């Protein structure tokens, strides 16, 4: 996603944290002036201008392009060296949960987890390798040139003309999505990537013309918006498991 999609996933999630995860997220965020779950959500996309070294190391962590293999993930083939979103999200979840690490290490892992749960729910981050997740599919959208990747990351969301305060309650108004019965941080990333890939491959998502407009928006923007809500609910369920699961009896 672009920055608004990432923030909206975080804002949906933030309100769904259990008290244990609420306290721990807030404690990690408090170590960085002005940080909120929403404000850190775009951070991993900004690393060219914030941390170039980490930016180079983590560029491939935003994607897993499995569509040519019918959306059936295989880590050795699709994720050599762990360099894809499935394995990155698993590892960063482990790091985030490791209370023996420094607050700085765990806050960095939180930034990645918040961002990557968003990206792994973006269909065009789990699509074809050969066209760079739809980036090479250039099209006219209304009167403007774009590409299929950008259309899904931000172009359709932008048609609402809403800031986050207007968009958030619209996402919250949707019918509740069906989640996994319990979060498994090591297994769910593959499930989510495969589901996102199947959307990339659904009828008409790749359009039959290179001039699209309101008919495309009206059919597919609801699906993009459903994926934001789903991503936010899944992010809260994951943070509740990773940061909200300690067996505690102190008053
Ligand atoms: Zn993104
Ligand atoms: Zn993207
Ligand atoms: Zn990203």
Numbering used by the authors: 27 to 277
Paper text:
Nucleases of the S1/P1 family have important applications in biotechnology and molecular biology. We have performed structural analyses of SmNuc1 nuclease from Stenotrophomonas maltophilia, including RNA cleavage product binding and mutagenesis in a newly discovered flexible Arg74‐motif, involved in substrate binding and product release and likely contributing to the high catalytic rate. The activity of SmNuc1 towards c‐di‐GMP in crystal resulted in a distinguished complex with the emerging product 5′‐GMP.
Purine nucleotide binding differs compared to pyrimidines, confirming the plasticity of the active site.
